[PDB]
């Protein structure tokens, strides 16, 4: 049962924030009902196993997930995979099992500080109810809510661009790169 | 056989069983899964091509490959030819229910209480319970969905409204 | 009296004003304990004591007139006239307590809970509580009453604050 | 003595007061453990041990004078005189334990349970802790050496003073 | 002893205590599984293996010294002497299993369930133990699987306990 | 109950910063998932007891931990052990239960002021996003993050040398001493 | 609640420096864990009440502290106590609950200028890290840290004398007086 032991070791090195990010990045293959009570890496791994995206012979999805959160030490220690191999694998078209849209959203999310978050919340006061603008909400919560009310999606980006333009412009660079990639 | 049936009945989930009962309600309840499968084998058509589609409807590819020794290709071909077993109405209902949290169903049972008794709905119920209660009240059908669409719009879930519109356009 | 407007009002209010609203309607819903805003409003609707005038009065009390303007399209003048021409849903004692709670900072709650530490216990006051919570706890001991505000008067005088003492005396003279 | 009075009393109280009341009444109902406070009150009424004065005493133990003023239409002085006259159902030991539990914050009870983990084995409360200690036949209204020693060790001397004063009263 | 004695015992026991008692007497309930704890006690009494000494042994095993003092008026020394002298009703295997179950937490037991779902394929630890016994994967002579599982979850104190017990029994 | 009382007394004499230092120093024997919900020394001692690295008859690891954080008064009071005994014991090979690399990291971290911290964060803008370069972070958090992204392993130190060369050079002396130890 | 009101009045007049001095003076009566979150006089009074060292019957401790911190106006206003009474009480053996070690340390701390503090820090920068030797740090923090590293204590005072002899002798005179007292 070494596979289960390896999975447990991998899961034991995750805090709350990494678990939240992983949960967010799996919205494309996990329904909200199956995701509401998830509070540990083991439960998420079981959920992925239920859809047969994770097994001994199939580790690509886990590798991509761990790569996207930059936890390279976990990749190298247990999965015996280096950065170059993952970069080459993701460079190959058809190997991408996660939309670059979500990846771009997550990367943008990582580039906001608390003051920038407050400025973003203040800017989006007009179009969003204060109930969804709770001070406890993070960027990912706002993104999930906006996607829920279909005010922001794959083709709906103009409000996002306008709001993000105030804080920074490299965000516009990332958005333009993603658009050109499509 | 019988061992495969025992594994199937023991490897499922209570909410999964509830979803299965809700889906099989369309064909036309047995509290246990085993009795329902016996009924399907006896009166209905307990074909492999049908059970595979039924399990694929609930995203259980692990049991699909483990037990049937078949991948998603067979069920994909079966769906492409014809979805004999289930209806797209039930499929859309289950898909909508799969995308709601506790707050969503709480708001739904609060709002729909306008013309439903408090004891009729009771509490601690899933979206399938709301759907079957509305069916008993006889105002929700695969052709009449305007009231449901409006109620959904009220709780600010417009992506699901677009999904409803897309389903209505398809059929 | 739809539940739709009820949900709209509930979502449009922060948690800060939720507790104030629960405190303001404590007397009317006194035979039962209300857990949150939605359940309290449901109880009022079931009891039949909830109407559009009651909701407008409560919104005026919490001072969210813009919500009435956007939803009910009603200004503060109309609700003020309605309150003048109709019995008050909320006692002046309750609104006085709420205004006092609003008119203070966290720099004073520590001093106040220290002053009345004899009556209460360490565990009860260990967690952070608002002024209205302390008022409710004092009421549970029957030490503060709408017709009996002497202890609160003394405590307010003890913190070198007298404008609130003048407000309390004004309410007493209003009796 | 109406059952509706009982229901009103149950409605007025919250979960914490219910827990404290259950702990207080645990001793008399040693034969039957009531999972619910309503069941406890019904049992007391059936046994006849619940009366107007008994209810007033029980409510006063929880420090809820609003109900007495409103429902029972009584003050603290009349019930105090009655208790000075009528024998009390609860022992001074139980109320002392409740008072001690009132003055301990959730931080230090963790320290106490960490100290006492040697003699036993999760959101524990002080009342639950003393119930567990009673179940293991370690803390009794007679002997209180363990609690006094542990309280002294954690730099809580006022509770030691209270326990000593109670002991000198006996 | 009498019917009222066992009735009081059933009344005073807790659901977790009843479950642990049912698990513990599984070895002596080999002939038939009793659906009820009181049914099990009646069967044991009618089987002749149940006596005052046996009842005290069970109560000590479930750590209910308060009932023994209140009901049977006995001390821990008496039951210790009875255990030392009279033959032990149940194997220390069950005692060790129960003690281990007293320490594992909900997160811990869930992690263990995820670990051991590989060989198999809400449930408590004791339920997992009885499942493993049903599959005949663990026996009072074989513990290497359980030892390895406990080692993998970084709970080494239980491994030390198990090794010490295995040394003691042989 | 003298042992537990002594442990409680020891725990009563530590601030938040000492607790953070201990949590950082015990990362090898404690995974992150258990590390996160710890806000007092008592829970940490419970975990160590669970792993049987500390008991009534075994106190070596606790003594090592207390000495490594430069807290000798507790050692002489509640353990009756001075600096000489601990140093002599540490002289014994195989008794250094803490890898010297962690000790070196802690020592380096202990010799940086606020201005030096700001300079370090400004200099680490090369391969690290500014989100981890916010002023909230401390040096130990920077080490943890760098260790996560396999840029500061036990054998990977040149980046650390390059960044530290911009503030002080005695740090290079410390690193050279550590290397000479290996 | 007159007594509590008087206590609050007494605590009102205290400032940040007075609060810090009081926090230092109660080291043997308040361990670090309780000491750290203290940021007002009221919390300190509550903690003192916990150990039954301040109440209606016994008020000697508060008078002793106020006399030590040289707040005579507060003593004569809110306590109806004179300096002569305090001196008479302190003359009686066993009445003082503050170690003369701490008293003389505080007295030395009160007799240091900024230049003298800088000279002390420069003289004792060899054995102490610069982070604890920050300019904002006063003499009390340095003394606390020195007590932590068992380099300064009742049985060891030579280092203190050697450092203090570089500026003034009257401080060494007070040290000699304390030595001869015990």
Overall body shape of chain A? globular
CATH fold category name of the largest domain in chain B: Death Domain, Fas
Q: Which structural class best describes the helix and strand composition of chain A?
A: mainly alpha
Indicate the multimeric state: heteroheptamer
How many strand elements of chain A? Answer: 0
Topology pattern of chain A, helix = H, strand = E: HHHHHHHHHHHH
Q: What would the CATH topology of the largest domain in chain A be?
A: Death Domain, Fas
Q: What is the helix tally of chain A?
A: 12
Main sheet overview of chain A: none
**Helix fraction of chain A by DSSP (H/I, runs of at least 4):** 55-70%
Q: Output the radius of gyration of chain B.
A: 17 Å
Relevant CATH superfamily of the largest domain in chain B: Death Domain, Fas
Q: Most extensive interface, residues per chain?
A: F-G, 18 and 13 residues
Order of helices and strands of chain B: HHHHHHHHHHHH
Description:
The complex is a heteroheptamer, with three copies of chain A (182 residues) and four copies of chain B. Chain A is mainly α and 182 residues long. Helices cover 61% and strands 0% of the residues of chain A. In chain A, helix 8 runs antiparallel to helix 12. The longest helix of chain A is centred in the C-terminal third of the chain and has 12 residues. Chain B is globular and about 50 Å long. Chain B is built from twelve helices and no strands. Chain B folds into two domains: 84 residues, Death Domain, Fas, CATH 1.10.533; 81 residues, Death Domain, Fas (Orthogonal Bundle), CATH 1.10.533.10. With 171 residues, chain B is an all-alpha fold. Classes of the chains: A mainly alpha (182), B mainly alpha (171). At the F-G interface, helix 6 of F face helix 3 of G.
